[PDB]
């Protein structure tokens, strides 16, 4: 996964 996409929708 990631990791570089914070939050709800990235």
């Amino acid at each position: 996964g990631a990791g570089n996409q914070p939050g709800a929708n990235g």
Partner: antibody
Amino acid sequence: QIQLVQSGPELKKPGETVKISCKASGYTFTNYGMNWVKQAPGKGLKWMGWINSNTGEPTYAEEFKGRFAFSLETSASTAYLQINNLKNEDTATYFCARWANCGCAMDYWGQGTTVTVSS
Amino acid sequence: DIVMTQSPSSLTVTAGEKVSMSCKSSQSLFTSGKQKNYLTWYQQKPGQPPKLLIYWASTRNSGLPDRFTGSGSGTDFTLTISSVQAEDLAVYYCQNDYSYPFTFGSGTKLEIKR
């Protein structure tokens, strides 16, 4: 065995410029974005922003837009925070912190860098 | 944006007791699709960086003792300590992680009566 090591404390005059390094080791660097957090002396925590380790794209909180720059050096697994035109309000400790693999929390933290702005 | 109001600012308890700290939002922190909460609890002992305690509002981090339980959802959250030991003197911070900007709370400072 994952460590974030930040550069040492610095004294800078008002108007001068500072760069803080954050060398990470122990994980694949370009898979975890890097956050910065401000703590004024004796005061609480404020989230400054984060930078994408993969793409390079920074994202700043509204208070830190304009005088603050996030950058990366991927070949050295090191994130950088730069503060321009230093003011008195910038005396604080600055933490670098890593996004967890969830994307829901900040997992590993550096030990902080204290900047003192004084003539 | 999400303002995180924490309560009370400082609270004092006797060693061994159980206590409650509150974290309240402006807007809800619920995904509506993943049915998971994007709230995180952090602990800052004096002179240290913050330490990750609880992510997803109740899931504990690796290596944590079983005396910290927070289980809220929506806009009302609480962090509770089962037996306060002397090593738990610290400031506790909640963080919104649902959307930018990923705001912190003001902090609850927990002190011991002996």
